[PDB]
Write a protein that binds this ligand. Structure first.
Ligand code: HEM
Ligand code: HEM
Ligand SMILES: Cc1ccc(-c2csc3nnc(SCC(=O)Nc4ccc5c(c4)OCO5)n23)cc1
Ligand SMILES: Cc1ccc(-c2csc3nnc(SCC(=O)Nc4ccc5c(c4)OCO5)n23)cc1
Lengths: 373, 373
């Protein structure tokens, strides 16, 4: 893989994300760096209006434009939701909305905060010579103090990285159905299932670095979007760029390319049929960075690893395939238990809707098991 | 173009659809082939309810699966809507629901009748040695006597095929862009406009073979589906396959790859924001064969033909590209005239939503012209 922007260490993550912009954009940076205080002391909105409609033309490298997106995306959340408890803005200042939409169009992503922004691009190592681990790592932005947003963002990223180990064997698998090499394929599927089993370990860390109550009271606010949102029913107005309100969806790990590309690899009927779930997940592809959506595209047009395996009447082969499917059921099964703790309960002091979505995706995964006959 | 399943001469249409099934399946063929007589005599349902569960395992190749889908899809519409004076069936008998659904799953299509069924796979040459012309062609199934379904399907299909020739030239377009080959690119763009222009002469045939009254009051019922339909608010029950009612959209030529493909190639933004029109056309992609779905998808991963033309300050290129865009505008403007005669007019002797839709799509196409006028 090359023009798909998949790092070999860091998979779908942005390889070594920028921390600072051209100082020509200090107005922007300062707000973002101080988002907890500004939101708390209501001076946030006040400052966004204060700013000047800057030009995105002083952003030369991809890496810098991604940071800008994460910067603007973050401000935009805080401006719309404010302190979080109801005072919602329906118009976005031209001085921030025009540059944001211009940069967004340039990048083929929607002008709203997206997984690829605040997980894949929103991080650094504390020490550059120690390894990519939780304790050697930090985020670049949070919404509130004690919003638990480091735990959430980093544990996500860590899983994204555990996954890259498997993404590297994706071409091996394709070449092996091609060259008809059965022994290589089996090894390859095994390597994959192994990598996905390790990524279940990483998941456990959620419990260590995220508190249910802080998580649910706070992070939920800043992940909401303006598509099927009661609080903004018509969508949002981007002053300057759009005449009308536009509906864009809030944050979803459905936007992760890791789990979408395994669904596709193993030919899990993830986006076929037409239940809400298959719809939604398809839409989230338009909220992935173009090269990743393209990479998904290319896998779908290769031929089905499920079909191959199905058609070969080779039990050992069947079993490698099942190892994979089983591993992916564990992840989703663990993720659901996490959702009970960090969402279902806190909400007991909307949600079942989210459960149904999860269970449906988990179910489809499970119905993919081969030796279920 | 390789196994995007696009024919040299027939494009997205099925190359030589099979008219007959295996003998094992005569009980299906009988009903399908006599839909108009069974409905009218009030004994279609009973003939269906009296049917054996049949395995799909004697349908071995793609063509016969596609045929079987056509057969079962027709029966389903017939069974559900009966005569369409309002006595709906909300539950699809196991002996039908189950195979249809299995086959649908095997072909990654929703289990409801689609454009790829009724149009792309529902035809035959009368004399094989003679060319593809209305006169030399017939459909395999219709629903009522004087439904004009023949004229409807056959003329769409001729339009479809007319645009085939333009499809052949897509690869040349991409090759010419990257080789930086200005004269060739010009020739190819002109060549595409030529095909779209001719596809419009084809569209004229609609008047000769479809009658407004019958089209509106008869065909419209069997093309209706169960997504957001007041008559089936929760959708259909596919008996013995889903412990739940499923919502699927009725036939839409939004499911035609052809018009979506040129929208993509030309960089017309048929996903302008999250506007209803945009979302809907995206939805309809899921109701197309997967090969064809991939094709649209992989076009989106090539460099914009539009960016390339805007960047080059070449009047003769801008006019070639504009000719292509005009041609589409024409088709769509003719199509609205046609909608007026065949739906708005009968309608008044709901339909305002169809207009908004079509008008938005026309409008989007128009705002794509480089010369503003
Ligand atoms: C506090 C911890 C977490 C909570 C409360 C949580 C909650 C949820 C919820 C509610 C959804 C539903 C989709 C949506 O609303 O858009 C979801 C989807 C998802 N989450 Fe999480 N999540 C957590 C951590 C993680 C982590 C660390 C990952 C790993 C990258 C992850 C991966 C996913 C994926 C891939 C989906 C998409 C659905 C699927 O493929 O099964 N989540 N999450
Ligand atoms: C009796 C003649 C026709 C009538 C009454 C008619 C009606 C309609 C209606 C109501 C729509 C609205 C979208 C929807 O509900 O799915 C539509 C869309 C469409 N029709 Fe037709 N149609 C006719 C003939 C044709 C023919 C011959 C073609 C050629 C393939 C065609 C191509 C389309 C396309 C591509 C769309 C999607 C909108 C677009 O891309 O511009 N239609 N049609
Ligand atoms: C920009 C961005 C997108 C995705 C992620 C991310 C990383 S891992 C993961 N799993 N899901 C997600 S985003 C969906 C989500 O958490 N929704 C949700 C959360 C809390 C709630 C709630 C719904 O309703 C009640 O409180 N995500 C992080 C950032
Ligand atoms: C299975 C199948 C799919 C598409 C086509 C097809 C071929 S060309 C074309 N253009 N549109 C369409 S399908 C959409 C449609 O007919 N909608 C509609 C809405 C209200 C109406 C009405 C029609 O008739 C009276 O009231 N279509 C034919 C069959």
């Amino acid at each position: 893989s090359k023009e798909y922007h998949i790092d070999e260490e860091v998979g779908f993550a942005l390889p070594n994300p920028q921390e600072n912009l051209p100082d020509f954009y200090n107005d922007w940076m300062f707000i973002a760096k101080h988002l907890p205080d500004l939101i708390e002391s209501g001076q946030l909105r006040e400052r966004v209006e204060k700013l000047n409609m800057l030009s995105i033309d002083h952003l030369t490298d991809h890496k810098s434009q991604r940071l800008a997106r994460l910067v603007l995306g973050c401000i935009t959340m805080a401006y719309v939701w404010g302190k979080g408890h109801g005072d919602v803005r329906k118009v976005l200042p031209r001085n921030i909305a025009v540059p944001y939409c211009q940069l967004s169009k340039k990048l083929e992503l929607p002008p709203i905060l997206v997984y690829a922004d605040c997980v894949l691009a929103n991080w650094k190592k504390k020490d550059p010579n120690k390894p990519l681990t939780y304790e050697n790592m930090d985020v670049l932005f949070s919404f509130r103090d004690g919003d638990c947003s480091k735990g959430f963002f980093l544990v996500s990223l860590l899983v994204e990285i555990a996954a890259a180990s498997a993404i590297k064997v994706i071409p091996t698998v394709f070449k092996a159905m091609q060259m008809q090499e059965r022994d290589t394929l089996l090894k390859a599927l095994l390597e994959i299932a192994s990598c996905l089993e390790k990524a279940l370990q990483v998941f456990h860390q959620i419990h260590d670095h995220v508190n249910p109550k802080a998580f649910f009271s706070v992070l939920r606010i800043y992940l909401s979007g303006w598509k099927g949102n009661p609080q903004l029913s018509d969508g949002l107005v981007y002053e300057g760029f759009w005449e009308d309100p536009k509906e864009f969806a809030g944050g979803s790990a459905g936007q992760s390319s890791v789990f979408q590309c395994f669904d596709v690899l193993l030919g899990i009927q993830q986006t076929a049929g037409g239940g809400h779930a298959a719809q939604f997940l398809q839409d989230m592809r338009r909220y992935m960075p173009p090269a990743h959506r393209n990479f998904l595209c290319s896998l779908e047009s290769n031929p089905s690893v499920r079909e191959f395996v199905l058609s070969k009447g080779d039990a050992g082969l069947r079993e490698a395939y099942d190892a994979c499917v089983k591993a992916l059921v564990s992840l989703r099964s663990y993720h659901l238990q996490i959702v009970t703790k960090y969402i279902l309960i806190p909400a007991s002091q909307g949600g079942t809707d989210l459960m149904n979505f999860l269970k449906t995706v988990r179910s489809t995964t499970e119905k993919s098991l081969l030796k279920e006959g």
